[model samples]
Target chain A: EFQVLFVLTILTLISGTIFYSTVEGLRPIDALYFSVVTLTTVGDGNFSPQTDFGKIFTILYIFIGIGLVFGFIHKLAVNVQLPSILSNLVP
Target chain B: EFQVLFVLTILTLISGTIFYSTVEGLRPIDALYFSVVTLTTVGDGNFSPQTDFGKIFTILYIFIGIGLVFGFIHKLAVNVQLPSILSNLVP
Candidate 1:
């Protein structure tokens, strides 16, 4: 379940980066960087979509990518199962 | 289940921001911003830990906080099930 979600998230991110690179005419690294920034809502103000398609893509990508990536991480967290020491800590 | 995780992530992020603001002497907003950037792995390079404690806290925070926040987002995604229209698209 988690494996599938993880792979899907990767594909989504990769596709997003490719889309930005092709449409925005950005370098591969820059496109990849922007995708992460947007998905995470960091909004560093360093880079952003300039074209209409880029803007729409960013909007849609954020909606989808954030959930998928976060979902993957969530699954891993469940599997990691924090140590009993942490779990048993007295409030 | 998801609510608990979501609350925990919020508390962790808030506490981390407080810690950074107090220890790093950054503004409240700056601390919060830095915390998000670190957890999301954006590494914007606009802000970073400057003290030994800050640096160490950041390292540990990244490991723990990222999972919690990502997990929260994941749970939300699971609940918000995308429409079959999108899901059924032929690859």
Candidate 2:
């Protein structure tokens, strides 16, 4: 379940980067850079949306990002609930 | 403590977005998109600061964003240190 969630998050970020690059005509590196910044909320301001469509996409993306964060938190809570014998990640 | 910190983080983000939109001549959506992108550190290169003040703002925003990330990690660690049942979010 955790692995699935991690994959989902990565895909979401990657898709976001692709979207910006295709729609905004940004270099792939810049698109990828922005995607990571948004997911992490680092706010370095190296790039942003200038079009209305881009703006709307940005807001929607942020809302989904927050949801992903909550889902991850739940995942952690479940992990922490594991019984001592089952809890250790290392054998 | 966690709730307070979360609220503070949200306010910071909202204020930062507003600042960019008003100062950089970005539409609210663009500001929001840039704000989220910067905070998350994804950093797609669609829009960027052209002025000295804007550059200063971006640097400050990134620093604050990193601080928030660390603060959140510390908050989580503190929570994890709670007694077994006490650590649970749901009663």
Candidate 3:
């Protein structure tokens, strides 16, 4: 679970970087940065989608990106049974 | 589990809002906004921590807030056995 999602997470970011740069007219570096901040949900507000399509893509990016990243982390943690401890408070 | 964490998640945001407003001197509304953005890891970046303590607390907030929010979602998913499908990619 961790390994495959790990691979997927990287691809998600890389693909998103290229997508944002071409779609949003941002430089490649800025595109990469935007993909990362959005993925991490660290939004920082520095760069944002200016175009309507860019904005839509970003919304899509946020859901899929955060899901992939968090999913990977959660799967990794569950494999190791980290949740039992964390969920103690939950119960 | 979801019930307990549902409460904790709200408390985390409420407490964070008060903390950021008082420490960072952001308006109350802005503090609430910041807490939600940071909690969701959406970051949007419009406002950021300006003071030294504010920065440190924001860092702390990100770790705990994301952990709690993601943790709760993961717990709920596990309760419904969602990861079995998600982890189908792995083993």
Candidate 4:
């Protein structure tokens, strides 16, 4: 599970960075910065997409990207861990 | 739990969307679009509030929304899944 999400996160980071930088004309650092900012939802005003297309793409990406990444993390946490910990307390 | 987070996610999305469109004067789609963008922290510069209020609101929402969502997902994963996987690894 972690392996899957980790791979996806890396891929998304690569493709996302390229899309934001080359297509959107942001510097690579800014693109990466913006990606982390977006992934974490920090939203500093100094950066954003200038075109409507960029804006629209960002909306879709966030909705999908967050679900995919966190879902794996969620599965790993609950389905794998909690029961054992609880079992120890009970028995 | 997933139930609470899921409900809150939808509620936040709905209320946020309405607030963006009605109060901010953004069309529904544009407002929805911006809300997702901000929540995801993608910061694509497409449609923004264009006022100080919008900017400030965006920052706060981004911070709170992303943190809450990720926190829930994280809890679900680590608390639930990791131990199970590790037990299998051991036994």
TM-score, every prediction: 0.52, 0.50, 0.48, 0.51
lDDT (tens digit, per residue) of candidate 1 on A1-91: 6667767777887997899899999898888888766776665466655565765566456645777766567776775554445577857
Residue range A1-91, candidate 4, lDDT tens digits: 5675666677766777887998799888888777766765565577666667776677656654565556655766786777878778995
Docking class of 3: incorrect
Which model scores highest in lDDT?
3
A67, model 3: CA deviation in Å?
Answer: 1.8
Q: List model 1 lDDT by residue over B1-90, tens digit each.
A: 767976887788689779989999976666666665567555544566879999898888988888877676666576555434236544
- List model 3 lDDT by residue over B1-91, tens digit each: 7788768977997898799889988666667666765677687556678899988988888887888877665565454435555667466
Clashes of 4: 24
Better candidate by DockQ, 3 or 4 = 4
Cα deviation at A6, candidate 1, in Å, is 17
iRMSD, per candidate, in listed order? 6.8, 6.3, 4.9, 4.8
Backbone clashes per model, in order? 2, 24, 8, 24
The residue ranges of model 4 lying beyond 4 angstroms of the native Cα positions read A71-91, B1-19, B27-29, B37-91
Q: Give DockQ: model 3.
A: 0.22
lDDT of 2 by residue, B1-91 (tens): 7677667767877887788888898777667666766665555465777778888999998888756744644464345322332345346
In candidate 1, the residue pairs with backbone N, CA or C atoms under 3 Å apart (3 or more residues apart, or in different chains) clash, namely A71-B74, A74-B71
The local distance difference test score of each candidate is 0.70, 0.67, 0.73, 0.68
